[PDB]
């Protein structure tokens, strides 16, 4: 699925994602857009071939199975393939996990490139919230 801007900030605040962790809902609007540009199936492989999957781009060496990372952990214990439902729920539940884990959204390589330090407001703006 390939989520409109404000069609995905409010199934993101519905999952509770807003001022998760203190990160507003801009943030994660924000970095859903760069990394997966709202596209739920959006996969990219690493460098360490691992993959990033999902509209957070979740990676396969940390964070999800996809049973060709070899030596990589599963610490949101789903296969990588749930992160690529149109149902977002697995992929914040994820983030979350993510996000939580001490380095908050740095985690995500777009947030910080792309999104931290800027109006992420923006992304949420003319949204119905
Ligand atoms: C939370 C999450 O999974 N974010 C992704 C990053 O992890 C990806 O960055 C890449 O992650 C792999 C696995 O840890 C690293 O080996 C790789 O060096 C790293 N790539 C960079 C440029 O840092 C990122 C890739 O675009 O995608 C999400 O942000
Ligand atoms: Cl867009
Ligand atoms: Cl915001
Ligand atoms: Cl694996
Ligand atoms: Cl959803
Ligand atoms: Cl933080
Ligand atoms: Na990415
Ligand atoms: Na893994």
Redesign the pocket.
């Known amino acids: 699925k390939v989520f409109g801007r404000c069609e995905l900030a409010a199934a993101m605040k519905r999952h509770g994602l807003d001022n998760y962790r203190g990160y507003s809902l801009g943030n994660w609007v924000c970095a859903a857009k760069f990394?997966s540009n709202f596209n739920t199936q959006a996969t990219?492989r690493?460098?360490?071939g691992?993959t990033?999957y999902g509209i957070?781009?979740?990676?396969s060496?940390?964070?999800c199975n996809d049973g060709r990372t070899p030596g990589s952990r599963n610490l949101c214990n789903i296969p990588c393939s749930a992160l690529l439902s149109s149902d977002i729920t697995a992929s914040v539940n994820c983030?979350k996990k993510?996000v939580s884990d001490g380095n908050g959204m740095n985690?995500?390589?777009?947030?910080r490139n792309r999104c931290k330090g800027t109006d992420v407001q923006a992304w949420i703006r003319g949204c119905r919230l």
Not at 107 to 111: F, G
């Open positions: 990394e990219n690493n460098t360490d691992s990033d957070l781009q979740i990676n060496r940390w964070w983030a993510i985690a995500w390589v777009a947030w």
